Amino acid sequence: RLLKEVKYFLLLRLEVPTTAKDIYTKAETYRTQIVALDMIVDNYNHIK
Amino acid sequence: GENEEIIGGTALEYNVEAGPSKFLIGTESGSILTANKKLKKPVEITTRYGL
Numbered sequence: 001r002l003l004k005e006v007k008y009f010l011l012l013r014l015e016v017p018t019t020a021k022d023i024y025t026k027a028e029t030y031r032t033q034i035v036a037l038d039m040i041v042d043n044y045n046h047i048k
Numbered sequence: 049g050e051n052e053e054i055i056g057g058t059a060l061e062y063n064v065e066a067g068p069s070k071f072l073i074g075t076e077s078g079s080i081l082t083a084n085k086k087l088k089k090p091v092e093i094t095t096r097y098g099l
Contacts, residue, residue, distance in 0.1 A: 011053070011077065 003027050055079075 006024040009016055059074035066072070071083045080097035 011055070 003030070 002020070003024070006017065006020055006027070056076040057073050058076055061072040061074075062070075069084050071085065073081045073083060075081065079099060081093050082095040082097070084092050084094050086092060
């Protein structure tokens, strides 16, 4: 919800959070890594 | 220009009489864009209804 919150603040401009930029730049990398991670995670479950 | 912000496509409209050329797309910011698909350049965003 924080990751989504940062994007809508940039859209309205007004103001922005302090040191939450670093979380939002990598944000995209987390959303590839979480999916990528998932991939394996699932397989483990249905493997167990 | 240079300012490129990615804004969520909230609504899409498509009709026979308009044809397979035009796709009328609404956004989160409030604007409405039009994407004419081409066999030439993979896609083009022609008109900007309410910039």
